[PDB]
Amino acid sequence: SLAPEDGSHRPAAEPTPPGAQPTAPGSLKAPDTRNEKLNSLEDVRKGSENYALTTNQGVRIADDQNSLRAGSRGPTLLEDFILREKITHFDHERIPERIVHARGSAAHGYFQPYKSLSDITKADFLSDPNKITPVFVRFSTVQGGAGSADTVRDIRGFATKFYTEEGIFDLVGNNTPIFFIQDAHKFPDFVHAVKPEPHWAIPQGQSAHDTFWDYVSLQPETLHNVMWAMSDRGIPRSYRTMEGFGVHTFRLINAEGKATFVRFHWKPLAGKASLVWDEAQKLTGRDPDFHRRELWEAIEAGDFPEYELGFQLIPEEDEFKFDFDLLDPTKLIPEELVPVQRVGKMVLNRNPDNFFAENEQAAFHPGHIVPGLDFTNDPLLQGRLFSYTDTQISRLGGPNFHEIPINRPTCPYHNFQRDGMHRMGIDTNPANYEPNSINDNWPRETPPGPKRGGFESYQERVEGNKVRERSPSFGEYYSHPRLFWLSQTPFEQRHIVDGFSFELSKVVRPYIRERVVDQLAHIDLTLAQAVAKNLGIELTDDQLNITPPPDVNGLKKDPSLSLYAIPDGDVKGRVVAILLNDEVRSADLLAILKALKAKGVHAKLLYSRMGEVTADDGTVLPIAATFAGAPSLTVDAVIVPCGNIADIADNGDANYYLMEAYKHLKPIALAGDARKFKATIKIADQGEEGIVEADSADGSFMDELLTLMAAHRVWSRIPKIDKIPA
Amino acid sequence: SLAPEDGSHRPAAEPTPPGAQPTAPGSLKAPDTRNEKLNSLEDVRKGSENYALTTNQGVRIADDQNSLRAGSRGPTLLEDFILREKITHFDHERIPERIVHARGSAAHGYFQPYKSLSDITKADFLSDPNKITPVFVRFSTVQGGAGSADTVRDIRGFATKFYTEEGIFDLVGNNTPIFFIQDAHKFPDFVHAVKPEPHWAIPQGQSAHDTFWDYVSLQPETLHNVMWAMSDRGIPRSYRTMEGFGVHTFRLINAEGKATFVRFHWKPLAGKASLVWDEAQKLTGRDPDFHRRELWEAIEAGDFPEYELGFQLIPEEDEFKFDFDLLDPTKLIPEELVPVQRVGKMVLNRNPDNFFAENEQAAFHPGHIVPGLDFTNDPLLQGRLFSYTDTQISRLGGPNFHEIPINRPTCPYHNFQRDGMHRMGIDTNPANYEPNSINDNWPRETPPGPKRGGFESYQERVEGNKVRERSPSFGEYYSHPRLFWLSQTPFEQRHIVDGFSFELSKVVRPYIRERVVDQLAHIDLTLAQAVAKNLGIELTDDQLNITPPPDVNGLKKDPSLSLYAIPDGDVKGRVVAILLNDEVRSADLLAILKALKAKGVHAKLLYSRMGEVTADDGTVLPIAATFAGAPSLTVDAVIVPCGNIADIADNGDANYYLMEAYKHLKPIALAGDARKFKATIKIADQGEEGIVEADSADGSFMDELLTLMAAHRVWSRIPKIDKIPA
Ligand code: HEM
Numbered sequence A, B: 001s002l003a004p005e006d007g008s009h010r011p012a013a014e015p016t017p018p019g020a021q022p023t024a025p026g027s028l029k030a031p032d033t034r035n036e037k038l039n040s041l042e043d044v045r046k047g048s049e050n051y052a053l054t055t056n057q058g059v060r061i062a063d064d065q066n067s068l069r070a071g072s073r074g075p076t077l078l079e080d081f082i083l084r085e086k087i088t089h090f091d092h093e094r095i096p097e098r099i100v101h102a103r104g105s106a107a108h109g110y111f112q113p114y115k116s117l118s119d120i121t122k123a124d125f126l127s128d129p130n131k132i133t134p135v136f137v138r139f140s141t142v143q144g145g146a147g148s149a150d151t152v153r154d155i156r157g158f159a160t161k162f163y164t165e166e167g168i169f170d171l172v173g174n175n176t177p178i179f180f181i182q183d184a185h186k187f188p189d190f191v192h193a194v195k196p197e198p199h200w201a202i203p204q205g206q207s208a209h210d211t212f213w214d215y216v217s218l219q220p221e222t223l224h225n226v227m228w229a230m231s232d233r234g235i236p237r238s239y240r241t242m243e244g245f246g247v248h249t250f251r252l253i254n255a256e257g258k259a260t261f262v263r264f265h266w267k268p269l270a271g272k273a274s275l276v277w278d279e280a281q282k283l284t285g286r287d288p289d290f291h292r293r294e295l296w297e298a299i300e301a302g303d304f305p306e307y308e309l310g311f312q313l314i315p316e317e318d319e320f321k322f323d324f325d326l327l328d329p330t331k332l333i334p335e336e337l338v339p340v341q342r343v344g345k346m347v348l349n350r351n352p353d354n355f356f357a358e359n360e361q362a363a364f365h366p367g368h369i370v371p372g373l374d375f376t377n378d379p380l381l382q383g384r385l386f387s388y389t390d391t392q393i394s395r396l397g398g399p400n401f402h403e404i405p406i407n408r409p410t411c412p413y414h415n416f417q418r419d420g421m422h423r424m425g426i427d428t429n430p431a432n433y434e435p436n437s438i439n440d441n442w443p444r445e446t447p448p449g450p451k452r453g454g455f456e457s458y459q460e461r462v463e464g465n466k467v468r469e470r471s472p473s474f475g476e477y478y479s480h481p482r483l484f485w486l487s488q489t490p491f492e493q494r495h496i497v498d499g500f501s502f503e504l505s506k507v508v509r510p511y512i513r514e515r516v517v518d519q520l521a522h523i524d525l526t527l528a529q530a531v532a533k534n535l536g537i538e539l540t541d542d543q544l545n546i547t548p549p550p551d552v553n554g555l556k557k558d559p560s561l562s563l564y565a566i567p568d569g570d571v572k573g574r575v576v577a578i579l580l581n582d583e584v585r586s587a588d589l590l591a592i593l594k595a596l597k598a599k600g601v602h603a604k605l606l607y608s609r610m611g612e613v614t615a616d617d618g619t620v621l622p623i624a625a626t627f628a629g630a631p632s633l634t635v636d637a638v639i640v641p642c643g644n645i646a647d648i649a650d651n652g653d654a655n656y657y658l659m660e661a662y663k664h665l666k667p668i669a670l671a672g673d674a675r676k677f678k679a680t681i682k683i684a685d686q687g688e689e690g691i692v693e694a695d696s697a698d699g700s701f702m703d704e705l706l707t708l709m710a711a712h713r714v715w716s717r718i719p720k721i722d723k724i725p726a
């Protein structure tokens, strides 16, 4: 018995804030959170307590510390089958990572529609507001490998497996509403250009290198999604505070056979929020697992990620009514033109038990649709349909990947497919073909119908010759990048210019930087000039005179394209660092902590060492982390209570903690003598917007700080940080 | 879509300093650098210039931009075999990463011995000082995945494949002289404890988490290698500046049949150097590919990594003469007791052409020995001999991994093995068994002998019962960690205390911290008290009274265990940042560059934007990177010439550059009006050792900076950095 007798090895099976208890497998942390998929995995969940250690053949092991040898200092013997099984298993633990989106973090949850959508789709999962569908969701980055960092600048994947009563539907989306390329034939080119360069395999997790920008400079279709990656959309605060999009136009099909075009959206109920670049890049070093950690810990705290599914619907008669083609995945549909209709809510409320078994082996594929949905001829979508089933034959070892437990449907599945590696199901049908008489033709085809019918494709007319040709309707590249640029606030535009400037500075061949800047000049002269200035490039008179692309259907901006132009702040589940001293003013800390708790904001108590400190009134304060152990990168705001401020006033880490938070536009609150830190961040005596300061943490101090938190960052500080040495 | 007319897309095929040209495949960068193995790969090298793009079947492609569809806005057709081949290959590009040491960087080179070693070994590659053996070397970290960061705290792998005339010998070593565990049966337990925890797969690249420290606290045999990992050995500056060790005792066997025990060493001819923790961890975010890039660039510059192979030799009759067991891989052999005899030199002088095909697919295995070498009964080595052939069956797809080009011997190989997946070799032998008459028994066995003989194992006597039992002589765990601790300088001891304090601060369950501090108290009470203080733990009276472990065969210290106690600095291949201004004093820059050039030290010219700046004499200076783009973490020293210092005096990034370099103990040199930066880092008018300052850069100024660089870091500054907010 190695566990401590006090039971402190084991986390409480109740919701607890981040850092209060060790994390645990979801079924041990939240045993009473259930859904139909999580219950169906009970057949394969394996416990451990009170069981004997055995080989995989069920033979009990007596000595798991030693190989069998001839003499205690002698050679190891080949007949040691217990050693060889253990090491064989170990030796073959790894499977290939996903070719793209290899770095991802997943959780279980459930979806429910707000109302029946039977007028527009016969999909069973959207038929009844009382019908709950379990989901499994994986969020990801794109370029880096499974052991790369979370807070890179990249697009994010947002993939949802809906375990419906009429089959698995996978909605395999990203966090921007378009893609970089138009036709799937180019996907290996684009991905090879953004991935580490093939001679030396550098850089990981970064598009900031010559081959990415070479491709971009030569393929202007990429410029719209490059604009989104360069904006703060490319560095989200958390998977909870980003949007999701299916990108492509798909179809909904109703029981009368009417097709409606649809684009899928997820709205984050926590609001939209991103980091700033220097913070994101630094955080990839201080905590490369920051998003995976934040997701897991938000679920263990009960801060469940929630998202609203929404549809942009366009009738079939309106296919050609826009300046852009609905089938072009480099074009977005502005919400000012076509509103998102709210459809239902997804809640992710349980972490997996075993990351490899559930996250690593999960297989999502956008070809997994159900009756009531159909495809369109978007030429990127069309190639995706080939790839996601093909890639599993090597990644997951064969064609029985649907029998891996996480991928199994919860509804019935029966057919005449047999064998393959890893075959789990033992078919008892006398027939393995149809038509057959020997089993009366079962399992049988089902005609299409309003409910529980077979799948039939919408009978779209096709007319044309067999060609390898891009539609001329797709040959417009600059207007949507411009619409995005003009929709951002002034600080978002500054961050876009700084993103392109930093990335192009890492491109070693200067002519590629010049070719990118020339593309920028086809989008917006202000953007191109500001990027060119940071690169020491002067635009030519010809570039200064390029006429801007046309507005999109008359729009010169759409505020739903900005992260921050329309406030949607939510403080619940955010975290504040509290910088302690060795005799904290306990009344300040009571007021601070209870105000945060009331709004669901978490706290981490920091000091210059671990263990405890004692407040003025004798209260014993446990320390969560040190100033360097839990840097300001990992929090949303910083509060310094009064007390013996001389204890930390000359601590370089305490001072730097405030400088780094200040640089990264975070709210900072200073009570009492903690106001002596104003000199460190060069605040004037009469104060400044974004710094909360008072004699004590009472009265309006916490309300002011929480108001700042709801607005996320102090954008007005940007010209001030510009010269702080941090 | 084509190359620039000036040819600047293509790097010069001559040696160039880092940053001067884009990096390139080795065979294009150094076409005249050859060796027998490099030549042998010509059969599979594929060019590209002037060739038509084709399918893998050799059919020319006309349009690689579009899928075949029915009309240009129509559905993609299943008969598009060109799209499907391209996307199938892409979908199957990934293979499983190595179970451990997945992150690694490799290069080609050659080895030769200084003199024949035929008196102690019949190994052909050690028999003649003028017979050169090609090598392929991979350096690696242990824990993280292939996409994790380079400058983590971890043990490093140092694996060398020698392509000898009598077979492939792989010397598969690490950068510390011991391992964490005694018997291979525990390898999966230890690896699972240090790897990301199974519920959530966090943390990547870090031992700073509960399960690792749980395992260490319960298995004190780990403490020796844990001491090495917590020292600055865990964070080398470059793979060129670390030691290598085979860890195990092996045997040499000479032509008369005599066995000598041996342990293998690599000594870095560039000297030993490591980062400091804050620098290392921040660099994982600013350049996660820092070691891979520095190795590739040193080779492109001509700063070839060189290492000296050395042997510790113990005669067979001295097996039991030490106070530790020679077969215990958690024990080192102190060089004060058994000196390292210099054996030969290895030079890495060419980068690979394709990282996947050469680095990712290389397979090293310590059971690949040759006549003149043999194993011992070390119980960790014994189990390794199983694992490295087993694991390639999944990683490399079957038993023909030796036909993957990088793994092929360059000597003859012939036998009766046949088939297996992706069999390349077409055997014409009418026999596939022996003995056979139908091919007159070829290929034939060869008796052992002095040279070109068959392998025979040394006929070691074996006497014991079949037991799973640890030798009692391996049950001592504290004396080697203590010897290591006492052999470090004071600043190295401080960094060890900091490494344990940082790591255990991230262990969430406090009792695990307490248990590790109790282990430390069994090694050295000063170490244990210093770690306990940082953790808010007080040692008990019983803990204060633990008797120190014994000295190791009378030694109180061995300075060969320290990175820094004995000067061994070599500045060739190091890099300095030069902070420019918009009117640099050209006479300062001339003097700086001339002095750096004479010592082989590279420079990177930095500014607040990219492009060029002009010096006072009209010299146009191209800018390598911005201050933020290439932080001080990436260089060894910082020099600031005079000129228009007002241009940069108030720039936050330039001031921070100096504060970060100062904190990280790097030499700084300030000329002329650049001395006004003394105020940012609080240097007294009188100056400080480690800050070079003068009215102009000249011979004396550069000689002083260069002397500082030869000592690597400014250890005397340590007490002055805790107050610095950086
Ligand atoms: C609209 C543009 C696209 C979006 C929104 C998208 C989204 C995603 C996401 C989120 C994943 C990760 C699934 C997971 O978390 O497990 C993924 C995986 C993948 N996608 Fe895509 N993708 C796009 C384009 C493409 C294209 C053009 C192809 C190839 C024809 C492709 C082939 C793949 C493959 C091979 C994987 C790995 C899947 C697996 O191993 O199971 N994707 N995609």
Ligand code: HEM
Residues within 6 Å of the ligand: A087, A091, B098, B099, B100, B101, B104, B138, B139, B140, B156, B157, B158, B159, B172, B173, B174, B178, B179, B184, B187, B246, B247, B248, B329, B362, B363, B364, B380, B383, B384, B387, B388, B391, B392, B395
């Ligand atoms: C002295 C202790 C050990 C040392 C110094 C060591 C060293 C290394 C190194 C340097 C590598 C990376 C080689 C490369 O660059 O590809 C490696 C890989 C590996 N080792 Fe070890 N190792 C040790 C113990 C063990 C043990 C006890 C086992 C299991 C019985 C083991 C099994 C493996 C496996 C399966 C790989 C990956 C091999 C591949 O896929 O090619 N090693 N080891």
